[PDB]
């Protein structure tokens, strides 16, 4: 059965996500304006959206049950390494198969392959990023599953620099078991079929997306003019 502690965990994660994810996208007006015309034209706007999305991910992270028992150093390690992955995951909510784009409520705030390309990132990242978004959209997760996946991604014990791995594992296991059990009791077939394993596979796809993101981040960063257009939080978190 799904236990009251597990039902509690889901409750917390749903509310945590509701408080950190605004489906109206009202704050996007604070970002430097988008420019689609112009090389690296989209960079200030998307750097700002990523920066924001980093803060919101931290807000979600803090509210994950057991995350607060970790050492600050370990909180930091886990956020640093997962941030881009959770941003990719949470972005599925605005991603639409209708036209393969992230639709954030208005054409100024709707982003596509060419827009990401105008942010300095190549198809090496973008082609497999979009694949990832289609494959995840196809899962048609319950919101409950969505929030658990993001949390399990954040609390991973194998991230490099992790001190108290045993404790990190104990937190993630609690979330993993919560997710397995939820799918069995709440997810009707055939949607539930191999759904856990398919979700876990997505965590592996994200590692590879993360690896590629890092290489391209490092390349773009070597030039200091690009780095100038990023935010301080983005420089601190991405390196």
């Amino acid at each position: 059965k799904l236990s009251e502690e597990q039902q509690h965990i889901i409750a917390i994660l749903l509310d945590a996500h509701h408080k950190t994810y605004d489906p109206t996208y009202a704050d996007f007006r604070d970002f430097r304006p988008p420019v689609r015309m112009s090389p690296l034209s989209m960079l200030p706007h998307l750097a700002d959206l990523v920066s924001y999305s980093i803060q919101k991910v931290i807000g979600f992270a803090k509210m994950i049950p057991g995350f607060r028992d970790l050492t600050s150093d370990d909180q930091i390690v886990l956020l640093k390494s997962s941030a881009i992955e959770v941003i990719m995951l949470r972005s599925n909510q605005s991603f639409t198969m209708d036209d393969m784009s992230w639709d954030c409520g208005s054409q100024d705030y709707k982003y596509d392959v060419t827009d990401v390309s105008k942010a300095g990132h190549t198809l090496e990242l973008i082609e497999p990023l979009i694949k990832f978004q289609v494959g995840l959209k196809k899962l048609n997760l319950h919101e409950e599953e969505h929030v658990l996946l993001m949390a399990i991604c954040i609390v991973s014990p194998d991230r490099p620099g992790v001190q108290d791995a045993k404790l990190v594992e104990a937190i993630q296991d609690r979330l993993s078991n919560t997710l397995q059990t939820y799918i069995r009791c709440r997810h009707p077939p055939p949607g539930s079929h191999q759904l856990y394993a398919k979700m876990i596979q997505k965590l592996a796809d994200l590692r590879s997306l993360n690896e590629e993101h890092s290489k391209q981040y490092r390349s773009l960063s070597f030039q200091p003019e690009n780095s100038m257009k990023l935010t301080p939080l983005v420089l601190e978190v991405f390196g």
Binding site: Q55, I58, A61, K62, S72, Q75, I76, L79, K80, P232, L233, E236, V237
Partner: peptide, 10 residues
């Protein structure tokens, strides 16, 4: 070594 991330995590 992460002043801002630390502040937002606190």
């Amino acid at each position: 070594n992460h002043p801002m991330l630390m502040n937002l995590l606190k």
